[PDB]
């Protein structure tokens, strides 16, 4: 047994969710199109994910609280009144599908961008619209199978809208739908994202493991040639220098290329001088590389590195939301699947276990609903870029 204090706390949390999420999403979609700098692919995806919650809350929450604290469903006897029970599940399922697919797309493009190392594009808009359509298409099942049934509270012929399946497909869906929900809205968003995160973490270490090695080999070969006694050592170190320069020039994206060409030409000049046996001329030519090294290569290495600093910052902002959403939606599934296979059909622990499971589910509902308003808070506390816009 759970008291009506549950009803009152449900009402208060619903009002809180409304008054917080409405404002938060309003400011977020105001900022996303106010600033001329915050326009890009990831930001367009975040704006779509944010707008997907206003049309859920400002419509679902009021009817939900009214029905929670009133006699029955609003407008019991109306042509469009019965449409409310059709619209109620459809919007929620579409919202959750939109959120999951948007997170998956964020993971996909985050992995893609790191590989291609060095304002909404057509591809981003196409993906956004495709996800928007697919969510509704997949969620129509909930809007087709909801109907109202009669009941006799205080002798009336009143209506209450339950899941009374009519078509054979509806019975088939009702027979097994919890497993499909669990797999689709909890497994794949928690599997593909992990795989793509691992791929990134691996490449980034690689795309930077090499650069450091190339820079190190150039510097240590410089140190070798600065003390090379004979021409053999000069040739041996200059071969490594040339290989390193050619390898590093490929990593450089299209200024810097001209500098790398100049460095290769100067290394060739030093090698040609060393071939004739003029050790002193070779040492002087190698010493001449200071002008090129501290004019083109240093800035290139600095920008490249610091660029990769930013790329990761976004990745962490994107991947915080996956963990937050998973922690929000885990408890409800936990109480939905332990009451299916190990369900308390006749277990003697109904004195203790049943109440605990009831409370867990009846708070998991609220925790899952809280996910429609927390995203502004997480973005504000973690992005450090939207934080500046929010402050202003």
């Amino acid at each position: 047994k759970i008291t009506s204090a549950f009803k009152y706390i449900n009402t208060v949390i619903s009002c809180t969710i409304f008054i917080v999420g409405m404002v938060g999403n309003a400011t977020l979609l105001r900022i996303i199109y106010q600033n001329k700098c915050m326009r890009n692919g990831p930001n367009a995806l975040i704006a779509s994910l944010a707008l997907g919650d206003l049309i859920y809350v400002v419509i679902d929450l009021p009817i939900n609280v009214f029905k929670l604290l009133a006699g029955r469903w609003p407008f019991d006897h109306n042509d469009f009144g019965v449409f409310l029970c059709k619209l109620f599940p459809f919007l929620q399922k579409s919202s959750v599908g939109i959120t999951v697919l948007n997170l998956c797309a964020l993971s996909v493009d985050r992995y893609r961008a790191v590989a291609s190392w060095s304002g909404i594009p057509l591809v981003t808009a196409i993906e956004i619209v495709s996800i928007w359509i697919l969510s509704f298409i997949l969620a129509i099942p909930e809007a087709i199978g909801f109907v109202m049934v009669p009941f006799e509270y205080r002798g009336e012929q009143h209506k209450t809208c339950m899941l009374n399946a009519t078509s054979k497909f509806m019975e088939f869906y009702q027979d097994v739908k919890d497993w499909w929900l669990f797999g689709f809205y909890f497994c794949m968003p928690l599997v593909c994202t992990a795989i793509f995160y691992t791929l990134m973490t691996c490449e980034a270490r690689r795309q930077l493991a090499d650069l450091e090695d190339n820079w190190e080999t150039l510097n240590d070969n410089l140190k070798v040639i600065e003390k090379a006694d004979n021409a053999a050592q000069v040739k041996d170190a200059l071969t490594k220098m040339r290989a390193a320069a050619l390898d590093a020039q490929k990593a450089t994206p299209p200024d810097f290329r001209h500098g790398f060409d100049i460095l290769v030409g100067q290394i060739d000049d030093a090698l040609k001088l060393a071939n004739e046996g003029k050790v002193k001329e070779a040492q002087a030519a190698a010493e001449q590389l200071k002008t090129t090294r501290n004019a083109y290569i240093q800035k290139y290495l600095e920008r490249a590195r610091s660029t990769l600093k930013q790329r990761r910052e976004v990745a962490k902002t994107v991947f915080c939301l996956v963990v937050i959403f998973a922690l929000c939606w885990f408890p409800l599934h936990l109480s939905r699947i332990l009451k299916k296979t190990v369900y308390n059909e006749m277990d003697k622990n109904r004195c203790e276990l049943l109440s605990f499971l009831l409370l867990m589910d009846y708070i998991g509902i609220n925790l899952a609903t809280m996910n429609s308003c927390i995203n502004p808070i997480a973005l504000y506390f973690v992005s450090k870029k939207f934080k500046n816009c929010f402050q202003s």
Partner: antibody, heavy 124, light 109 residues
Framework: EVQLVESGGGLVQPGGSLRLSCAAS????????LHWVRQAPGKGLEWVAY????????SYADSVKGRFTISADTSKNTAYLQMNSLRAEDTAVYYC?????????????????WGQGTLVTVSS | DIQMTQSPSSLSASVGDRVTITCRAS??????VAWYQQKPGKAPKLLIY???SLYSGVPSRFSGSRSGTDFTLTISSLQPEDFATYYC??????????FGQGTKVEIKR
């Protein structure tokens, strides 16, 4: 198209001397370097010598160092290779290849046009 | 210096097969490696440069690949014009140039 033609080969006695001629047509010598590559009968390919027409730098491998002299004439558009103190093992087929200069793509194409091959034999 | 080793010395293959040859270097040379084709009594002709690039005038069935220090040449379809001697070269600089021993491809019966 770019053409390279080798000539001036024949049988010589051991310790003799010989001179070749790799003529270039269809392109300027001062825009592409020249190299000589030797192939023994039934063996692999090996490097011999190299001349740059513009800079004038010439290089040789340890197999022919001290007995092979490589030069060229830009006005004649022809390179020459002179061998002295030939040996019996030295007999082989020689080719004259070309290679571009560094800045830009032509360096990345390596040997793109070869000659035809000149057979040199040493016997008594 | 910088010796190059070719894995298969001889290789028997019939028409319409896939063949692969491997070259290995002794030093960290970049993509400066090339392949040549030679029929007996003729000057070799270029096939691939920069370790992955088609030279104008060769069929698209020829392909190359780079992975670290090892290099791989692949022919997906072994047409009756692919029975020759294939050679493998590195050209990191003008003076230091070395060749491989060569590979001979023949019929299978």
């Amino acid at each position: 198209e770019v053409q390279l033609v080798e000539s001036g080969g024949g049988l010589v006695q051991p310790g003799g001397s010989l001179r070749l001629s790799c003529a270039a047509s269809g392109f300027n010598v001062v825009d592409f370097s020249l190299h000589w590559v030797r192939q023994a009968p039934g063996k692999g390919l090996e490097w011999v010598a190299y001349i740059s027409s513009s800079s004038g730098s010439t290089s040789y491998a340890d197999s022919v160092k001290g007995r092979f002299t490589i030069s060229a004439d830009t006005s004649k558009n022809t390179a020459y290779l002179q061998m002295n103190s030939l040996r019996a093992e030295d007999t082989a087929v020689y080719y004259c290849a070309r290679w571009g200069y560094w800045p830009g793509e032509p360096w990345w194409k390596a040997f793109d046009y070869w000659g035809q091959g000149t057979l040199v034999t040493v016997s008594s | 210096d910088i010796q190059m080793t070719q894995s298969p010395s001889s290789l028997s293959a019939s028409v319409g097969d896939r063949v692969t040859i491997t070259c290995r270097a002794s030093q960290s040379v970049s993509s400066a490696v090339a392949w040549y084709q030679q029929k007996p009594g003729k000057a070799p002709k270029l096939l691939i440069y920069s370790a992955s690039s088609l030279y104008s005038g060769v069929p698209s069935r020829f392909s190359g690949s780079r992975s670290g220090t090892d290099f791989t040449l692949t022919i997906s379809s072994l047409q009756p014009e692919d029975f020759a001697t294939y050679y493998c070269q590195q050209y990191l600089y003008y003076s230091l140039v070395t060749f491989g021993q060569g590979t001979k491809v023949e019929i299978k019966r």
